[PDB]
Design an enzyme around this catalytic site. Structure first.
Site, PDB file in Angstrom:
ATOM      1  N   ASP A 159      -4.766  -5.051  -2.416  1.00  0.00           N
ATOM      2  CA  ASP A 159      -4.039  -4.193  -1.505  1.00  0.00           C
ATOM      3  C   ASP A 159      -5.008  -3.425  -0.606  1.00  0.00           C
ATOM      4  O   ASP A 159      -5.568  -2.420  -1.013  1.00  0.00           O
ATOM      5  CB  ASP A 159      -3.174  -3.208  -2.293  1.00  0.00           C
ATOM      6  CG  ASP A 159      -2.351  -2.244  -1.463  1.00  0.00           C
ATOM      7  OD1 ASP A 159      -2.200  -2.551  -0.262  1.00  0.00           O
ATOM      8  OD2 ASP A 159      -1.906  -1.203  -2.015  1.00  0.00           O
ATOM      9  N   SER A 168      -4.447  -3.308  18.219  1.00  0.00           N
ATOM     10  CA  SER A 168      -4.132  -4.565  18.827  1.00  0.00           C
ATOM     11  C   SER A 168      -3.983  -4.330  20.332  1.00  0.00           C
ATOM     12  O   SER A 168      -3.517  -3.282  20.748  1.00  0.00           O
ATOM     13  CB  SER A 168      -2.861  -5.177  18.226  1.00  0.00           C
ATOM     14  OG  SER A 168      -2.430  -6.326  18.940  1.00  0.00           O
TER      15      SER A 168
HETATM   16  C1  LIG Z   1      11.013  -6.786  -0.439  1.00  0.00           C
HETATM   17  C2  LIG Z   1      10.281  -5.996   0.698  1.00  0.00           C
HETATM   18  C3  LIG Z   1      11.548  -5.423   1.521  1.00  0.00           C
HETATM   19  C4  LIG Z   1       9.704  -6.943   1.761  1.00  0.00           C
HETATM   20  S1  LIG Z   1       9.375  -4.499   0.127  1.00  0.00           S
HETATM   21  O1  LIG Z   1       8.826  -3.691   1.253  1.00  0.00           O
HETATM   22  O2  LIG Z   1       9.876  -3.830  -1.107  1.00  0.00           O
HETATM   23  N1  LIG Z   1       7.870  -5.603  -0.496  1.00  0.00           N
HETATM   24  C5  LIG Z   1       6.903  -4.673  -0.858  1.00  0.00           C
HETATM   25  C6  LIG Z   1       5.707  -5.447  -1.589  1.00  0.00           C
HETATM   26  C7  LIG Z   1       6.305  -6.089  -2.854  1.00  0.00           C
HETATM   27  C8  LIG Z   1       6.600  -7.424  -2.935  1.00  0.00           C
HETATM   28  C9  LIG Z   1       6.987  -8.033  -4.132  1.00  0.00           C
HETATM   29  C10 LIG Z   1       7.067  -7.297  -5.341  1.00  0.00           C
HETATM   30  C11 LIG Z   1       6.731  -5.941  -5.263  1.00  0.00           C
HETATM   31  C12 LIG Z   1       6.395  -5.357  -4.035  1.00  0.00           C
HETATM   32  C13 LIG Z   1       6.174  -3.899   0.250  1.00  0.00           C
HETATM   33  O3  LIG Z   1       5.832  -4.549   1.256  1.00  0.00           O
HETATM   34  N2  LIG Z   1       5.821  -2.639   0.057  1.00  0.00           N
HETATM   35  C14 LIG Z   1       5.046  -1.894   1.059  1.00  0.00           C
HETATM   36  C15 LIG Z   1       6.124  -1.287   1.941  1.00  0.00           C
HETATM   37  C16 LIG Z   1       5.623  -0.281   2.878  1.00  0.00           C
HETATM   38  C17 LIG Z   1       4.467  -0.283   3.566  1.00  0.00           C
HETATM   39  N3  LIG Z   1       4.477   0.876   4.296  1.00  0.00           N
HETATM   40  C18 LIG Z   1       5.610   1.524   4.080  1.00  0.00           C
HETATM   41  N4  LIG Z   1       6.336   0.840   3.227  1.00  0.00           N
HETATM   42  C19 LIG Z   1       4.120  -0.964   0.298  1.00  0.00           C
HETATM   43  O4  LIG Z   1       4.559   0.091  -0.189  1.00  0.00           O
HETATM   44  N5  LIG Z   1       2.860  -1.394   0.132  1.00  0.00           N
HETATM   45  C20 LIG Z   1       1.840  -0.643  -0.648  1.00  0.00           C
HETATM   46  C21 LIG Z   1       1.350  -1.552  -1.784  1.00  0.00           C
HETATM   47  C22 LIG Z   1       2.431  -2.261  -2.639  1.00  0.00           C
HETATM   48  C23 LIG Z   1       3.249  -1.269  -3.409  1.00  0.00           C
HETATM   49  C24 LIG Z   1       4.303  -1.991  -4.264  1.00  0.00           C
HETATM   50  C25 LIG Z   1       3.648  -3.057  -5.159  1.00  0.00           C
HETATM   51  C26 LIG Z   1       2.800  -4.039  -4.348  1.00  0.00           C
HETATM   52  C27 LIG Z   1       1.796  -3.225  -3.487  1.00  0.00           C
HETATM   53  C28 LIG Z   1       0.601  -0.224   0.187  1.00  0.00           C
HETATM   54  O5  LIG Z   1      -0.469   0.271  -0.600  1.00  0.00           O
HETATM   55  O6  LIG Z   1       0.108  -1.359   0.947  1.00  0.00           O
HETATM   56  C29 LIG Z   1       0.773   0.893   1.208  1.00  0.00           C
HETATM   57  F1  LIG Z   1      -0.228   0.829   2.101  1.00  0.00           F
HETATM   58  F2  LIG Z   1       1.856   0.824   1.945  1.00  0.00           F
HETATM   59  C30 LIG Z   1       0.747   2.269   0.513  1.00  0.00           C
HETATM   60  O7  LIG Z   1       1.781   2.712   0.031  1.00  0.00           O
HETATM   61  N6  LIG Z   1      -0.418   2.877   0.682  1.00  0.00           N
HETATM   62  C31 LIG Z   1      -0.566   4.070  -0.148  1.00  0.00           C
HETATM   63  C32 LIG Z   1      -1.545   5.029   0.480  1.00  0.00           C
HETATM   64  N7  LIG Z   1      -1.616   6.285  -0.256  1.00  0.00           N
HETATM   65  C33 LIG Z   1      -2.056   7.341   0.718  1.00  0.00           C
HETATM   66  C34 LIG Z   1      -2.289   8.594   0.016  1.00  0.00           C
HETATM   67  O8  LIG Z   1      -3.423   8.360  -0.853  1.00  0.00           O
HETATM   68  C35 LIG Z   1      -3.006   7.421  -1.859  1.00  0.00           C
HETATM   69  C36 LIG Z   1      -2.780   6.156  -1.168  1.00  0.00           C
END
Ligand SMILES: CC(C)(C)S(=O)(=O)N[C@@H](Cc1ccccc1)C(=O)N[C@@H](Cc1c[nH]c[nH+]1)C(=O)N[C@@H](CC1CCCCC1)C(O)(O)C(F)(F)C(=O)NCCN1CCOCC1
Length: 330
Positions: free
Chosen positions: A35, A199
């Site tokens: 990630d 971009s």
């Molecule tokens: C089904 C979907 C509608 C397309 S969904 O959005 O639920 N898919 C999830 C990924 C997924 C797929 C399959 C099984 C489980 C999870 C998804 O794309 N989640 C993104 C949605 C998003 C992005 N931005 C806003 N919303 C996310 O939270 N990604 C984070 C990592 C994921 C979390 C769930 C498990 C898989 C890894 C992420 O880290 O990429 C992030 F960047 F968005 C994030 O939340 N970054 C956290 C940053 N914090 C800042 C403060 O300091 C601590 C770190």
């Protein structure tokens, strides 16, 4: 030194990718989601509340001779999609694709949210954003890449994600056979802790390229491509019957449609996302309405170049003193 590991989609839609990671002595192999949007290496574990584990492979630090509890350290994170986890911290040996880091912080989950429990295929996360985002308290910890960097032949990692197929993460070298043309490098801002870049614009299908700055992050842990509402509306307007659905919470389209490609700019270069990469299948089993892979970022606050975009490219995460991002077609 270098490392190289294969990354595999968890399902037929490429919702996420998992990569095997060896932890401890003897090795315990867990499948983690790499990630570039976060900076914590955390795992399902023997300490996870048992009712919150349903099919995942767990890390048991008591069975690793090199594990050491990091006294007083805890962690807690909440992700963009509303999921969360928290727990305690060990240091242990971690290897990815032949590249070994001793003394890596391994964050062991005591609690995970329901969405993690419900997904048996992801055993934890390996964060590749900048170490300033790491959540360990009271002493922040470094990422795998930060720990490995001085040992690497070059301070870089690359992501080569597959469409409906496995791909590769490499550490410390650029595989010049893995892309076509040249790699175009572009500036990175690290002020928010992400691989943030700008971009140079976009095109829809065979349309004219629109020169416009789009600030966003390169995020391997996000499935979709999240872009400004103007750009997203321009895309779906080219798909007959597509609409933004309040009840689904984004753009849907008829499963019978053929989708156009989407192009994004990297300096003077262009990356073309084929239309089939933008199809995420029926909204519910048996439905003839399908979910779109390009969605609005308006409710998020930043644009996100997630897997839909990155899997169209060979991507270089250059961790030199001044970081940069490289993109090549493939
Ligand atoms: C089904 C979907 C509608 C397309 S969904 O959005 O639920 N898919 C999830 C990924 C997924 C797929 C399959 C099984 C489980 C999870 C998804 O794309 N989640 C993104 C949605 C998003 C992005 N931005 C806003 N919303 C996310 O939270 N990604 C984070 C990592 C994921 C979390 C769930 C498990 C898989 C890894 C992420 O880290 O990429 C992030 F960047 F968005 C994030 O939340 N970054 C956290 C940053 N914090 C800042 C403060 O300091 C601590 C770190």
């Amino acid at each position: 030194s270098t490392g190289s590991a294969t990354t595999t989609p968890i399902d037929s839609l490429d919702d996420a990718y998992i990569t095997p990671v060896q932890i401890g002595t003897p090795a315990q192999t867990l499948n983690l989601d790499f990630d570039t949007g976060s900076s914590d290496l955390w795992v399902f574990s023997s300490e996870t509340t048992a009712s919150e584990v349903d099919g995942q492979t767990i890390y048991t630090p008591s069975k690793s001779t090199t594990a050491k509890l990091l006294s007083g350290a805890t962690w807690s994170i909440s992700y963009g999609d509303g999921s969360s986890s928290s727990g305690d911290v060990y240091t242990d040996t971690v290897s990815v694709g032949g590249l070994t880091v001793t003394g890596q912080a391994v964050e062991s989950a005591k609690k995970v949210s329901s969405s993690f429990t419900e997904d048996s295929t992801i055993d934890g996360l390996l964060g590749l954003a900048f170490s300033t985002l790491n959540t360990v308290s009271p002493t922040q910890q470094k990422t795998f890449f930060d720990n490995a960097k001085a040992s690497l032949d070059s301070p870089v990692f690359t992501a080569d994600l597959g469409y409906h197929a496995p791909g590769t993460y490499n550490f410390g070298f650029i595989d010049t056979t893995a892309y076509t043309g040249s790699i175009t490098y572009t500036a990175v801002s690290t002020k928010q802790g992400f691989w943030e870049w700008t971009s140079t614009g976009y095109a829809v299908g065979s349309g004219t390229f629109k020169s416009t700055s789009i600030d966003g992050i390169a995020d391997t842990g996000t499935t979709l491509l999240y872009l400004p509402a103007t750009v997203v509306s321009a895309y779906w307007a080219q798909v007959s019957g597509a609409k933004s659905s309040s009840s689904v919470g984004g753009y849907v389209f008829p499963c019978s449609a053929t989708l156009p490609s989407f192009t994004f700019g990297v300096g003077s270069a262009r990356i073309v996302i084929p239309g089939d990469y933008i199809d995420f299948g029926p909204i519910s089993t048996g439905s003839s309405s399908c979910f779109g892979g390009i969605q609005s970022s308006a409710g998020i606050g930043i644009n996100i170049f997630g897997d839909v975009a990155l899997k169209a490219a060979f991507v270089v995460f250059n961790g030199a003193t001044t970081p940069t991002l490289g993109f090549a077609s493939k």
